[PDB]
């Protein structure tokens, strides 16, 4: 029945990715004195399906100057990573329990950029290359601290396994102990997904659509899920990382309800941030992080290695 589990972790997510679009439209609208989609079915609950069919029956544009083989690999690579990087998440009991969960988290998160990379190159245009290279610049500043914050926070968890995160957070939230890191992790998770103040790669007002300029119909529709499935999964990563809920050993219902609510609350804040602030500049973004973020990471990581030894509070390895 393991295959049934695989679809049960894919299809329910896919509808969750679908309804994030409708929720974002309504959340953004109601934060705008607007109403949001409410004509497609009741309360606009049919809107994602309305856009769903249109895109997959939309004319999938093939640009002549594009390199076709690389053109099609990028949407496949973007979506494939998005789903497969859900599998180590410890929703009560993780689907794929591995001793190095967070390392696998970073690996496919780092693999994700090659979607916007190859697509940006294959589109063969000015706005295509501008978006792809600033996508390098946005993400080049990005893995260096993402690993450090992950290392510093987990250093008192005990290991890289995602399941044991719950045992560490059994008594109090992780955010109580590393709130300076949590704010900094949250900005980066807001940043790794190219969202809200850091959306240079898309840049509607300044790059029309960036990498997505020559991407229509399903090839576009695929790009939307990869972006939005990464939003939910990264927030779920933050929810377990910093706000690990209680887990009854006999009723996984309790953790599942609490964990999902935490992901919903965090994902709304992603839309909350997306509505409020303006958009940075890709030079300021890099300057913000390698001049202000990265120096704080090293000292905070310095603090979070010295702290367990000085307090005789090192965590068990097994």
């Amino acid at each position: 029945m393991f295959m049934i589990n695989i679809l049960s972790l894919i299809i329910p997510i896919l509808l969750a990715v679908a309804f994030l679009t409708l929720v974002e439209r309504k959340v953004l609208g109601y934060m705008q004195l607007r109403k949001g989609p409410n004509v497609v079915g009741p309360y606009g609950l049919l809107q994602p399906i309305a856009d769903a069919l249109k895109l997959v029956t939309k004319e999938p544009l093939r640009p002549g100057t594009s390199s076709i083989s690389m053109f099609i690999i990028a949407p496949i690579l973007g979506l494939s990573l998005a789903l497969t990087m859900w599998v180590p998440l410890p929703m009560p009991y993780p689907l794929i329990n591995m001793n190095l969960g967070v390392l696998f988290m970073l690996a496919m998160s780092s693999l994700a950029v090659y979607s916007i990379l190859w697509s940006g190159w294959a589109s063969n245009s000015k706005y295509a290359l501008i978006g792809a290279l600033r996508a390098v610049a946005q993400t080049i500043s990005y893995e260096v601290t993402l690993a450090i914050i992950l290392l510093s926070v987990l250093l008192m968890n005990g290991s890289y396994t995602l399941s044991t995160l719950i045992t560490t957070q059994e008594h109090i939230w992780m955010i109580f102990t590393s709130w300076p890191l949590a704010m900094m992790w949250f900005i980066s998770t807001l940043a790794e997904t190219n969202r809200a103040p850091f959306d240079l790669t898309e840049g509607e007002s300044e790059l029309v659509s960036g990498f997505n300029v020559e991407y229509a119909a399903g090839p576009f529709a695929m790009f939307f899920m990869a972006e939005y499935a990464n939003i939910i999964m990264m927030n779920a990563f933050t929810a377990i990382l910093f706000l690990g809920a209680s887990h009854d050993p006999h009723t996984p219902e309790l953790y599942t309800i609490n964990f999902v609510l935490k992901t919903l609350a965090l994902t709304i804040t992603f839309l909350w941030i997306r509505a409020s602030y303006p958009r940075f500049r890709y030079d300021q973004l890099m300057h913000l992080l390698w001049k202000s973020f990265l120096p704080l990471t090293l000292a905070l990581c310095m603090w979070h290695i010295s702290l367990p030894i000085m307090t005789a509070s090192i965590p068990p390895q097994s």
């Binding site: 190095l100 090659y114 190859w118 190159w121 290279l133 390098v136 080049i140 390895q317």
Partner: protein, 175 residues
């Protein structure tokens, strides 16, 4: 079958290794390396080196990422190469894929072989050992010894990266 799955994973490591060593367009070679790097993670992951596989995966994605930026920055042509367009890389491509084909056939057919070394093809599963690791992973615990046993290695390595930023600024200074 999955019994010689490592035999397979070893191969596409080299087909990707061949593809980018045939010197296609620089970013195309970047794809040719990463497929080999990605499958290369699989081989060492199969043997038990989970941490080694993840790190060679993680930083080489980071390594190849910065390579792509430079390729399109000042190392790309207005008429990019492909593995098929130019006959030279086409000749390099076709030579690579028959070189492994003729050899892995020979190695598998005879299972004794002579080239350079002697090789019993048999099965890579064979040399795994009847060992127990207890409540610790050797592949991860040995690396953890870097900070307790390899102080000299830490000093020499750490120092070298520091000049590594010095040289990376020394030679780029542009007068």
């Amino acid at each position: 079958m999955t019994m010689y799955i490592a035999f397979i994973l070893s191969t596409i490591f080299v087909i990707g290794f061949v593809g980018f060593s045939s010197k296609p367009s620089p970013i195309y070679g970047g794809l040719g390396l990463i497929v080999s790097g990605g499958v290369g993670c699989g081989i060492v992951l199969n043997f038990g080196g989970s941490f080694l596989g993840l790190m060679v995966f993680l930083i080489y994605l980071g390594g190849m990422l910065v390579v792509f930026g430079y390729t399109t920055a000042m190392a790309t042509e207005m008429y990019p190469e492909v593995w098929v367009s130019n006959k030279t890389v086409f000749g390099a491509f076709v030579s690579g894929l028959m070189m492994e084909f003729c050899m892995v056939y020979y190695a598998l057919k005879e299972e004794e072989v002579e080239i350079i070394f002697k090789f019993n093809g048999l099965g890579d599963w064979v040399i795994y050992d009847t060992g127990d690791s207890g409540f610790f992973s050797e592949e991860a615990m040995g690396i953890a010894a870097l900070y307790s046993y390899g102080t000299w290695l830490v000093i020499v390595t750490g120092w070298s990266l520091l000049i590594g930023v010095v040289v990376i600024m020394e030679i780029t200074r542009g007068n």
